Amino acid sequence: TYVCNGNVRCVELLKQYTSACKTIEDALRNSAMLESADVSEMLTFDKKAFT
Amino acid sequence: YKKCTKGLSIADLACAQYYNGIMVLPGVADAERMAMYTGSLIGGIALGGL
Amino acid sequence: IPSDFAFNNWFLLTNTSSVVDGVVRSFQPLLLNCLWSVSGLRFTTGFVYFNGTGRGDCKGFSSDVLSDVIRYNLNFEENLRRGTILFKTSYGVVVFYCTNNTLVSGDAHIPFGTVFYCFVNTTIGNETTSAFVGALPKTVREFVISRTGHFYINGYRYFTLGNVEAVNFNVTTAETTDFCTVALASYADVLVNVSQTSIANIIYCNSVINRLRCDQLSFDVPDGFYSTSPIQSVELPVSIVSLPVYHKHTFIVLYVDFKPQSGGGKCFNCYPAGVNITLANFNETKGPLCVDTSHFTTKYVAVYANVGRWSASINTGNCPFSFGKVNNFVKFGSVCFSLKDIPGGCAMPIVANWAYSKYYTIGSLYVSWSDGDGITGVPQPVEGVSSFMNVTLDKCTKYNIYDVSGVGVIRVSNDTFLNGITYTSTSGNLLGFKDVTKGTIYSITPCNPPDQLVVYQQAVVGAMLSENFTSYGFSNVVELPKFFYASNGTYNCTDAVLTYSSFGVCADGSIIAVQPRNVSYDSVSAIVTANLSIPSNWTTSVQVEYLQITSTPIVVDCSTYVCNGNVRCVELLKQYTSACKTIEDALRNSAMLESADVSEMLTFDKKAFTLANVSSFGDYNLSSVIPSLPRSGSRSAIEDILFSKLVTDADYKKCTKGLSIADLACAQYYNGIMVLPGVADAERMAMYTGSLIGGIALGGLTSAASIPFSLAIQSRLNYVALQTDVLQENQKILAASFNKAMTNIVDAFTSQALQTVATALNKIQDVVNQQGNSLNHLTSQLRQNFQAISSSIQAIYDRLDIIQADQQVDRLITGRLAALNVFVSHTLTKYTEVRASRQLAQQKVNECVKSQSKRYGFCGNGTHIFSLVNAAPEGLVFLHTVLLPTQYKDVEAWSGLCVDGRNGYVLRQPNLALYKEGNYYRITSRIMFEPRIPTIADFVQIENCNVTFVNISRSELQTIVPEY
Amino acid sequence: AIYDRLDIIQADQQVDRLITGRLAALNVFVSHTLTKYTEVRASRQLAQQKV
Amino acid sequence: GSIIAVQPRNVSYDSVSAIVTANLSIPSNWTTSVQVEYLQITSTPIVVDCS
Amino acid sequence: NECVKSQSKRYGFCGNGTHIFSLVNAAPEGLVFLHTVLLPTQYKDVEAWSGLCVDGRNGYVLRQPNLALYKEGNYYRITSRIMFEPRIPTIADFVQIENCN
Amino acid sequence: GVIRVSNDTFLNGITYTSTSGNLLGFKDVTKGTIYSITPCNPPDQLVVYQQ
Amino acid sequence: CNSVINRLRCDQLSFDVPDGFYSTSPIQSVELPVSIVSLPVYHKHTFIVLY
C-alpha cells in the first residue's frame, strides 16, 4: 500500500525484496502487538472499583 | 475509516491516512477499557481490600 | 502432485548462481499436466508437439490443460545405452553428433549416466552450422528446455533458443526398468525449500492461507493479524473529468517506409528503413515545430506488416517521457519537436527484429521539449465540442481530473467549496472536485481499501472489513456499529480464544467485546471495622523474564571493510582517517568499556563453585536449572534447549583451512566484520552463572559446601515476613507446580504463566532477529552500491583509470562511511539502551535475587520469594518465584480501637492489623495470615476513647493481649 | 504517472530508485519507532513504576 | 608477554543466611575507598538560525 | 538527593557496600561524585545459633531480619548483619514461640 | 585469496556466493571437484603495552 | 614511520599512542601469480585492435 499505492506492477517488483520489507513490517507489527500486550497486561478491571 | 469511505462528506485528514495506507490502529487504551481502568484505579484510591 | 513426493530427480532451476539450503518463492513449470509414464521407453521414443499426447495418468487435479512446457527428467541407473538426439524446431533441424572415442567422428553415442568429442549441426534456413559439445557432463539426471528456448541443466542456463516444434529421445533401452516417468507440464507459481542440495517440499499458492503463506516466504505461518488487499485488478471503465476548452488539433502522427528485404534466415543483405514524420508539415527555415494551442492530443501510426519475422519499435532514448503515452493525459509546453538534431533535446532509439537474433538499430527523429503547460495529449483524437466529461460513480473507476490521475469510486458530495476548483490532501491526492457546470462536487473514495484479516490454527477465520457482507465458506457474518466484523461462522459466543486490545474472538469465529483480564487485587485500608480477606494457600508460579545484558561486540577495520584489502583504497582512505579513525576508535573504546563493565560485574567464588552439586536441591529436583556436576573436570537444561533453538561463535583461525566450505560466521571474518568472542564467553560466563546460582543456597559461611535447602529458603521469605509455621507444604506444592511449569513450559520451548513464557520466547527471538537483520542490513548495504558501477572496488579499478576511479571510489566510500556512521550511531543507541537495561538487570540480580525487595510490582507481581537466573543469547533470563493470592481467608477487623482507659492503641508500624478471630485477639500481617502472638513491643498509648471501641481495662489487657 | 511516463525497463529503474529511497526513509522511520519504543519502554517502566 | 587464562576479579562477598548454627564472619576494620563516578547532567545547549 | 543526603538501604546502589556519604563536584557538562563507603577488609569470627527457642513456652524468632545472635562467650550479644557492633541484648526485639526443639 | 581444495557434491549449481556476494567455492567442470576460496589477508589484532 | 609501533602511531595521527588493541593488516602487497578459472568455450576472435 505504502509504496505500490495499489499498483500491481510495483507489487510484483516489491515482492522480491519482501525479506527486507517483510522484516520491517514484521518488526513494527510484532512490536505493536508486544506493546499492546504490555498495556493490556497492565490493564485491570474491578467490579468493586467500578461503583 | 469504514464510515468515511462513504457518505456526502469530504474525507477527514485521518481518513486520508487510511487511503494512503497509514492505518492508524485504534488506540490500545481506547476509550472503553481505558476509561474503565482509569476509573477502576481512581476508585481504588478510596477503596481497599474489603 | 503427491505430498511427500521425493522428486529427487526433479531439481531447481536458476538463471544465476544457485543458492544453497534456502526457501524462495518463484515461478516454475510445475502445473503437471500428463505424467506420461515412461513405461519402459524404447528406442523409438516419439515426438511431442506441445500437446497433451502423453502416455500417462492425469492424477485427478490438474488433469489436462494446454501443455506449456516439456522437460526431460531422467530416472535411470548408471548405465550406457546406445542412443542419438534429434531436435526439431521452426528455424530448422538440429542434429547432434558425438564420439565416445577420441576421434571426432569416433562412435556416435551420447554417454548415459556418469562419465568423448561431441558436436552439433544446426541448420538455419539453407545454412548449416556446427556446434562443439565442449565440456562433457559428469552425469545428467534432469534435462530441460523450453518453448521460449531457455536451456538450463541443473540451473546456470548455458543459453536460450528461439522456439521449437518437436523432439526425440532416441535411446535404446536394454534395462526393462529404464525409467519411472517422463512428463509434460505447465507453468505456475510456487515456493521451494531446498536444503544442502536436497529439496524438501513445496507449497502451491492457491488458497488464501497458502497465498499469505507464500508471501510469508515460509511454511505454517504463525497465528496473527496480517494485511491483504484482494481487490480485483480487472480493468474497468475509467471516467474522465476535464476543464472546458475547444480542442485545437494538436495530435502528433507518424509514417514510415520499410524496404522489405526478406525477413527469413537468409538476410545477408537486408535493407534499412526510412521513416517520414507525419505530425505536421516541415519548412526547413525553422527546424523545430510548435503547438497551435494548449490541447490534448497524440497518436502513433506505423506499418510493420512487411516481413515474415519483423517488428519495429522504439523504447526510450535519453528523455523520460515514453512516446505513445503522450496522449495519456500528459501536459507540456512548447516541446517543439524537430527531426533535425538540436541541443537540449533527447533522442529516440529505433530497432528492428529478426527473431531476436539481430537488432537492426536505426535512429529516428530526436525529440526535443521545453518545460510548459500548453502542449498536451489525449487518447481521444477530437474533443472540440468540449462536453465530454465521462463520469461513473459507484463503480470502480480510473480517473483523470484536471491532469490528476487516480483509481477509486466517485461519490457525489454536496458542499459549496467556494475557495477553489479542487482540493488535494496532505499527500497530494485530490479529495474532491466541484463541477464546472453547476457547482456540484464529487469526492473520490479509494477503490481498494486495505484489509486486515486473522488466521488461527493455520486457518483464516474472521476478518476486519468496512462492508456488511459475508465473504466466507461458513454460515453467518454479522455486522457491528461504526465498524464491521467479518466471520462467516455461527455466533454462539461461548468463549473467546483470541484477544486483541480492542476486540475478542471465539474459537468458532464469534466476536466478543474485549474483556480485560479480570483481577481482584487487595490494597491496604485505614483502621476500620470491616470484613477482610488475607491470602492463605499459595502455590508458586514462575513468571519468566528476559533481560538484555550485553550486545554482540563487533569491530570493523576501515581498510578491511571499505578497501577490502585494496592498497589504493587504503592510501586514499588514510587521508580521511580522522573521521574513520574516530569512528573505529569510538566503537573500539566502547567495546572495551562494555567489556570492562561486564568483567567488573563478573565475580567468581570458590565456595560457590561446588554449590552446583545435585545433592543440595534434594526433593526440589531443580536439576534442569541445576548447573551440571563437573564431568571429571575443573550448564542447565533451559540454557541448552535455548541453544538448541539458537537456529535462525567459533574461531575463524580454524575455518580458513580444511576441506569444508566456510560457514557464514567465517565469511564475516573474511569481510572484516570480526565478531569478537562474546564477553560472557562460555567459560567465565558459566562459572559466573554457576557461582551466583550456588550463591542462592549459599550464604556467608566458613565452608564452601551447601546447606540443607529446606531451612535455607525460609530466610529469603523471612525478609518479607516472619514465618510462624513449622511444616511447609507450600514448598512441595510449589515444587510440583514449578516442575510442572518446567515440564509444560519446556515443552512449549521444544495459565497466564504460559503467556509470560510466550512473551519471553518472543522477546529472545526478537533480539536474535534484530541482530541478524542488523548485520544483514549492513552486509546488504554492501550488497548495494550507492552510485557506483558495481560494488567490487577491484572490478571498479579494472573498469576505471585512476582519476575517475577515485571519483567513484570516493563516492562509494562516502556512502559507505555514511551508512557506517548510521550503524555506529545505532550501536551507540544500542549502547545507551543496553546501558539502561544493564542498570536495570544488574539492579535486579543484586537486589531482588539476593534480598526480596519491599516494592510490590517490582519482581513477581506480588509477594516475592526469590529469583533464579540463567544465561541466554546475549542476555539473562530469570525465574522469580513469588507468593500470590490463591485462597483468601475471612477475618473481622476493628477500627483501631483505643482502650477505655487513657490507654488507646494506634499502629506501631503500618504493615500490621488486628483482627478478632475469637475472644482472643491476634495481629496477622497485611501480607499473610501469620498469627503473630499479640505483644506490647508494638503498642502505644492514646487518651481519647471513643466508647465505640474496645472495652478493656489496663489489667485485663494482659488477659486480652499477652504483653508480658 | 511514472508508469504513464515510462516503459517497463526504465520505468523499473526509476521505480526501484524510488522504492530504495522510500524504504530508506521507512527504515529511518521504523528505527525512530524503535527508539521511541525503547524510550517509551523506559518511561513505561517509570510510569508503571510510580502508579 | 605470557598469556594467562582470563581470571575474573576474585571477590568473596557475604550474603544473609537463615537462622542456623554456623561459624560466621563480620566486617570489622574498614578503611574508606573513593569509588569515583561521572554523571551526565545536561547537554551543551545549542541554537541554530535557519537563515 | 538520596544517596548523598541519606544513605540508601539498597546495597549495590552507591558504594558497592555499606555506604556512608557522597561528595560531589562539577565536571564538563556533568557531575562527579565521591561515594565514601564501608566495605569488608577484616572479617571477625563468630558462632551463630539456629534461632534457638527457649525450653519454656517462650521461644525466639527474629523481630526484624537484619540482626542475628551470636555466642561470643557465656553471655549473648546481638551484632548487626552489616557490622560487629555489640548491641546490648534487649527485650524490645523478642517474641514468644511455643515449640521447643 | 588462496584456493583450498574442497570435497563436496554441491550439486545445486555451478557456484555459490556469500551474503556479501563473494563466491565461497566453485565446483570444477571437468570432474565435480570443488575449491573453496580462503581470504589472502586476514585481519590481524595486536596489542601494544608501555608504548 | 618505520617501526610497527611508529607505523600504527602514524596511523594514530599522534605521538605515544595509548596501550590497547588495534587492527593491522600487514599482508605483503607484492604481486604474485594469479590463477584463472573459466567456463569452457571455443574462443572466437573478438579482440579489438588499433592503429
Ligand SMILES: *[C@@H]1O[C@H](CO)[C@@H](O[C@@H]2O[C@H](CO)[C@@H](O[C@@H]3O[C@H](CO[C@H]4O[C@H](CO)[C@@H](O)[C@H](O[C@H]5O[C@H](CO)[C@@H](O)[C@H](O)[C@@H]5O)[C@@H]4O)[C@@H](O)[C@H](O[C@H]4O[C@H](CO)[C@@H](O)[C@H](O)[C@@H]4O[C@H]4O[C@H](CO)[C@@H](O)[C@H](O)[C@@H]4O)[C@@H]3O)[C@H](O)[C@H]2NC(C)=O)[C@H](O)[C@H]1NC(C)=O
Ligand atoms: C530466468 O530468466 C528468464 C528470462 O531469460 C525469465 O523468463 C521470463 O520470466 C517472466 C516472468 O518472470 C516471463 O513473463 C511471463 O510470461 C508468461 C507467459 O505468458 C506469455 O503469453 C501471455 C499470453 O499471451 C502473455 O500475456 C505474456 O506476456 C506478454 O504480454 C504482456 C502484456 O502485459 C507483455 O508485457 C509481455 O511483454 C508479453 O508480450 C507472455 O508472452 C506470462 O504468463 C506471465 O504473466 C504472469 O505473470 C505476470 C507477473 O506476475 C502477471 O502480470 C500475469 O497476469 C501472469 O500472472 C498470472 O498468470 C497466470 C497464468 O497461468 C495465472 O494463473 C496467475 O494468476 C498468474 O499470477 C509473464 O508475462 C517471461 O515471458 C519470461 N521470458 C521468457 C521469454 O520466457 C525467468 O523468469 C527467469 N527465472 C528466474 C529464476 O528468475
Ligand SMILES: *[C@@H]1O[C@H](CO)[C@@H](O[C@@H]2O[C@H](CO)[C@@H](O[C@@H]3O[C@H](CO)[C@@H](O)[C@H](O)[C@@H]3O)[C@H](O)[C@H]2NC(C)=O)[C@H](O)[C@H]1NC(C)=O
Ligand atoms: C525445509 O525442510 C524441512 C521442513 O519440512 C526443515 O528441515 C528439515 O527437517 C526435517 C525434519 O523431518 C529433516 O529430516 C530429518 O533430518 C535429520 C537429519 O539428518 C534426520 O536425522 C532425520 O531422520 C530426518 O530425516 C530434514 O533433514 C531437514 N532438512 C534440511 C535441514 O534441509 C526446514 O525447517 C525447512 N525449511 C524451512 C525453514 O521451511
Ligand SMILES: *[C@@H]1O[C@H](CO)[C@@H](O)[C@H](O)[C@H]1NC(C)=O
Ligand atoms: C496437437 O498439437 C497441435 C500443435 O502442433 C495442435 O494443432 C493439435 O490441436 C494438437 N492435438 C490435440 C489432440 O491436442
Ligand SMILES: *[C@@H]1O[C@H](CO)[C@@H](O)[C@H](O)[C@H]1NC(C)=O
Ligand atoms: C536413433 O539413432 C540411431 C543411431 O544413433 C539411428 O540408427 C536411428 O535411426 C535413430 N532413430 C531415430 C528415430 O532417430
Ligand SMILES: *[C@@H]1O[C@H](CO)[C@@H](O)[C@H](O)[C@H]1NC(C)=O
Ligand atoms: C555436419 O554434418 C555433416 C554431414 O551431415 C558433416 O559432414 C559435418 O562434419 C558435420 N559438422 C561437424 C561434425 O562439425
Ligand SMILES: *[C@@H]1O[C@H](CO)[C@@H](O)[C@H](O)[C@H]1NC(C)=O
Ligand atoms: C527409478 O526406477 C528404478 C527402477 O530401475 C527404481 O529403483 C528407482 O527407485 C526409481 N527412482 C526414483 C523413483 O526416484
Ligand SMILES: *[C@@H]1O[C@H](CO)[C@@H](O)[C@H](O)[C@H]1NC(C)=O
Ligand atoms: C465515454 O462516453 C462515451 C459516451 O457516453 C462512450 O461512448 C465512451 O465509451 C465512454 N468512455 C469511457 C472510458 O467512459
Ligand SMILES: *[C@@H]1O[C@H](CO)[C@@H](O)[C@H](O)[C@H]1NC(C)=O
Ligand atoms: C512519407 O513518405 C512518402 C514517400 O516515402 C513521402 O512522399 C512523404 O513526403 C512522406 N511524409 C509524409 C508526411 O507523407
Ligand SMILES: *[C@@H]1O[C@H](CO)[C@@H](O)[C@H](O)[C@H]1NC(C)=O
Ligand atoms: C448489509 O448487508 C446485508 C446483506 O444482504 C443486508 O441485508 C443489509 O441490509 C445491509 N445493511 C446495510 C446497512 O448496508
Ligand SMILES: *[C@@H]1O[C@H](CO)[C@@H](O)[C@H](O)[C@H]1NC(C)=O
Ligand atoms: C449455537 O447456535 C445455534 C443456532 O442458534 C444452535 O442451534 C446451537 O445449539 C448453538 N450451540 C451452542 C453450543 O450454544
Ligand SMILES: *[C@@H]1O[C@H](CO)[C@@H](O)[C@H](O)[C@H]1NC(C)=O
Ligand atoms: C471475573 O469476573 C467474572 C464475572 O462474574 C467471574 O465469573 C469470575 O470469577 C472472575 N474471574 C475469575 C478468574 O474468577
Ligand SMILES: *[C@@H]1O[C@H](CO)[C@@H](O)[C@H](O)[C@H]1NC(C)=O
Ligand atoms: C461481616 O460483618 C458483619 C458486620 O459488619 C458481621 O455481622 C458478619 O458476621 C460478618 N461476616 C461473617 C461471615 O461473620
Ligand SMILES: *[C@@H]1O[C@H](CO)[C@@H](O)[C@H](O)[C@H]1NC(C)=O
Ligand atoms: C488450605 O489451608 C488450610 C489451613 O492450613 C489447610 O488446612 C488446608 O490443607 C489447605 N489446603 C490446601 C489444598 O493446601
Ligand SMILES: *[C@@H]1O[C@H](CO)[C@@H](O)[C@H](O)[C@H]1NC(C)=O
Ligand atoms: C555431592 O554431594 C554428595 C552428598 O552431599 C556426595 O556424595 C557427592 O560426592 C558430591 N559430589 C561430588 C562431585 O563429590
Ligand SMILES: *[C@@H]1O[C@H](CO)[C@@H](O)[C@H](O)[C@H]1NC(C)=O
Ligand atoms: C527426579 O528424580 C528421579 C529419581 O531421583 C529421576 O528419575 C528424575 O529424572 C528426576 N527428575 C528429572 C527432571 O530428571
Ligand SMILES: *[C@@H]1O[C@H](CO)[C@@H](O)[C@H](O)[C@H]1NC(C)=O
Ligand atoms: C465515636 O463513637 C460515636 C458513638 O458515641 C460515634 O457516633 C462516632 O461516629 C465515633 N467516631 C469515630 C469512630 O471516629
